[model samples]
Target chain A: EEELREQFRVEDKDGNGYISAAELRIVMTNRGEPLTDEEVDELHRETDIDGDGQVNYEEFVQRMRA
Target chain B: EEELREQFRVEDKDGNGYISAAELRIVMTNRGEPLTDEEVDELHRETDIDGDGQVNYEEFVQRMRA
Candidate 1:
């Protein structure tokens, strides 16, 4: 949980307590293995459990540990 | 899909079509990060989307990629 929380904080660059799809794309690109737009779309579709366009901490953690 | 399928096969030691809580416990233990019984139960509850006692291939893959 500690590791996951730290990771979420790092990924949530805006400190908004949520990760937007765009932020996720940027993070993926930073890893030097960028996801295609389609991939990001799919990822958002899969991870944004509430269809809110942003992944909250719980959603992010669930996906990370999924 | 291929990687997930191979992982599922390896984890499903009994070759059953579903992954039971016991199998998940063993897999986690093999990773040197064993989960508590409560953790296994919670994981199963979360991943077994259809209220099934075991996780099917679809559920396994979804959780793996979640």
Candidate 2:
């Protein structure tokens, strides 16, 4: 995984070890890969398991390992 | 995507679509990013959803979007 992705995961302030939509946006924008809302939602559905509107470490690992 | 990672994906020969440990090892070694046996085993255990001893296309795609 890219360093930014790891940083995003580590910096998720909620302590859920995950990134919510807002968190993801910050990371994406900071990394110059700003995603549209639609893209975010799509990624959430594809990666988030519990549907808590966040991408946890498990989700992050699974996704970035790509 | 990194050329090496993409090439690794393409070089995966099994039609089942995901790289097995052996296949991934070959790609990594060929690309001069050889993984330790522990890393390979851990990745497989954690990422191989099907437990068929190999990762499939679905698993691979899921793992990358993080």
Candidate 3:
């Protein structure tokens, strides 16, 4: 979990403690995948459990555990 | 950092404070991408700084913040 959390913190970029839809794109971009808006939107819709447009730690855990 | 640390700790499946490549495959397999040997080996090459087949927390952090 710590490894994933480290990965998550890396993804969270801004140190905001949440992986926002925007942050996801940023992280992916840095990771060389560089998702398009549609792709980003698609991923965000499902991962953002509360529809908060951000994936909190718990949500990320679920995604990883999937 | 604490949040990331907590996640990293949980990820240390054996509670040894190290994320082993075997454990990586375990987590990776469970996470649905099901890593292959070469990929795992490659991951180890870069992430396991000491090349001991395990990733210490610092190495894990460096990988994440890469």
DockQ of each: 0.02, 0.02, 0.02
| Model 3 lDDT per residue over B2-49, tens place | 877987887787688877555665666777866553355346546867
Which residue runs does candidate 1 get wrong by more than 4 Å?
Answer: A1-66
Task: Give residue A15's error in model 2 in angstroms.
Answer: 2.6
lDDT of 2 by residue, A1-66 (tens): 468566755658566666655466455667787665335435554676665435677777777777
lDDT of 1 at B16: 70
Looking at model 1, the pairs that clash are: none
TM-score of each: 0.48, 0.39, 0.47
lDDT agreement of model 3 with the native = 0.68
Sort order, TM-score high to low: 1, 3, 2
Superposed Cα deviation of residue B2, candidate 3 (Å): 40
Error of 2 at A56 (Å): 1.5
Give candidate 3 misplaced runs (Cα > 4 Å).
Answer: B1-66
For every candidate in turn, the CA RMSD to the true structure comes to: 15.1, 15.8, 15.8
* DockQ agreement of candidate 1 with the native complex: 0.02
Candidate 1 residue B55 Cα shift, in angstroms, is 0.5
